[PDB]
Design an enzyme around this catalytic site. Structure first.
Site, short mmCIF file in Angstrom:
data_model
loop_
_atom_site.label_atom_id
_atom_site.label_comp_id
_atom_site.label_asym_id
_atom_site.label_seq_id
_atom_site.Cartn_x
_atom_site.Cartn_y
_atom_site.Cartn_z
N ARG A 33 0.88 -1.11 0.07
CA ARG A 33 -0.02 -0.02 -0.05
C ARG A 33 0.93 1.16 0.01
O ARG A 33 2.09 1.12 0.53
CB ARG A 33 -0.92 0.22 1.24
CG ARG A 33 -2.41 -0.04 0.79
CD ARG A 33 -2.91 -1.20 0.26
NE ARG A 33 -4.26 -1.31 0.24
CZ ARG A 33 -4.78 -2.35 -0.44
NH1 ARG A 33 -4.03 -3.52 -0.74
NH2 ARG A 33 -6.15 -2.51 -0.57
N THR A 45 3.89 0.80 3.18
CA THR A 45 3.77 -0.52 4.11
C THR A 45 3.17 -1.61 3.34
O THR A 45 2.74 -1.76 2.23
CB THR A 45 2.56 -0.33 5.04
OG1 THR A 45 1.32 -0.18 4.37
CG2 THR A 45 2.72 1.15 5.99
N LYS A 94 5.56 -1.72 8.20
CA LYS A 94 6.07 -0.40 7.36
C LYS A 94 7.49 -0.61 6.46
O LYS A 94 8.12 -1.41 6.80
CB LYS A 94 6.35 0.64 8.25
CG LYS A 94 5.38 0.81 9.36
CD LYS A 94 3.94 1.26 9.07
CE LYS A 94 3.20 0.58 10.03
NZ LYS A 94 1.61 1.16 10.05
N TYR A 103 0.17 7.46 10.16
CA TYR A 103 -0.46 6.11 9.35
C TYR A 103 -1.87 6.25 9.65
O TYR A 103 -2.38 5.74 8.73
CB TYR A 103 0.18 4.80 10.16
CG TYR A 103 -0.49 3.59 9.97
CD1 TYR A 103 -0.12 2.85 8.84
CD2 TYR A 103 -1.31 3.07 10.70
CE1 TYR A 103 -0.82 1.71 8.32
CE2 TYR A 103 -2.01 1.86 10.49
CZ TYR A 103 -1.69 1.28 9.24
OH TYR A 103 -2.55 0.06 8.89
#
Length: 212
Positions: A33, A45, A94, A103
């Site tokens: 992502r 991540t 991550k 995040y």
């Protein structure tokens, strides 16, 4: 009999065991992502979804004997994975250091979007989301650091942070709300989910299992 998956050098074990519930899960899918900055995709991540071993028996009924493509195209299949009578565990590792608030901001956005969308965003869910946010504040995720989402079928969302990539024995916060508890997963493999990478893994790996 199921493989593991490495995403950007971050490994996702084929199987895993919860130190909190003692339950066992198998890797359903993995993926990445990030953000797209002017056409360019910058990864941040890696994400993995684990399903409780009993999930197979549950899914057998309606999906044993389906094709990896039949599955991938059937929404009902994923609804069953999201709201199936078993525990789901989601691990986010991550690739690029992000703070807890950094995040959380986006995922919380997608969760509120989904919730307001399906008409289940009331005072309860709002507060639950504030608790959600609140749990991330004191945290930081250097590369390789992880976040664990334990989705209990009992309408509870377990939150625990790891300095590395192994499951922490105690959970940081418990979010008790049915709607929110599944929201996180919903934004990853739900209908209105962007990146099909996880949906594809699920559609590819489950068939084998659903036959034994």
């Amino acid at each position: 009999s199921i493989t593991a998956i490495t995403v950007e050098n971050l490994e996702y074990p084929a199987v895993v065991t919860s130190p909190v519930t003692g339950k066992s899960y198998f890797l359903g899918g993995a993926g990445e992502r990030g953000l797209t900055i002017e056409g360019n995709f910058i990864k941040f991540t890696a994400i993995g979804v684990y399903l409780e071993d009993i999930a197979v028996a549950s899914l057998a009924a309606k999906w044993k004997g389906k094709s990896s493509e039949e599955l991938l195209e059937t929404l009902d299949f994923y609804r069953d994975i999201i709201s199936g009578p078993f525990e789901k565990l989601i691990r986010g590792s991550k690739i690029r250091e992000l703070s807890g608030p950094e995040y959380s901001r986006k995922v919380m956005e997608n969760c509120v979007a989904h919730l307001k969308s399906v008409g289940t965003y009331g005072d309860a869910e709002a507060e639950a989301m504030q608790k959600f946010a609140e749990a991330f504040k004191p945290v930081n995720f250097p590369p390789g650091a992880s976040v664990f989402y334990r989705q209990s079928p009992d309408g509870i969302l377990g939150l625990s942070f790891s300095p590395d990539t192994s499951i922490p024995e105690k959970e940081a916060a418990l979010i008790e709300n049915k709607a929110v508890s599944s929201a996180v997963l919903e934004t990853m493999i739900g209908e209105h989910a962007v990146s099909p990478d996880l949906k594809r893994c699920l559609a590819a790996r489950l068939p084998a299992l659903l036959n034994e």
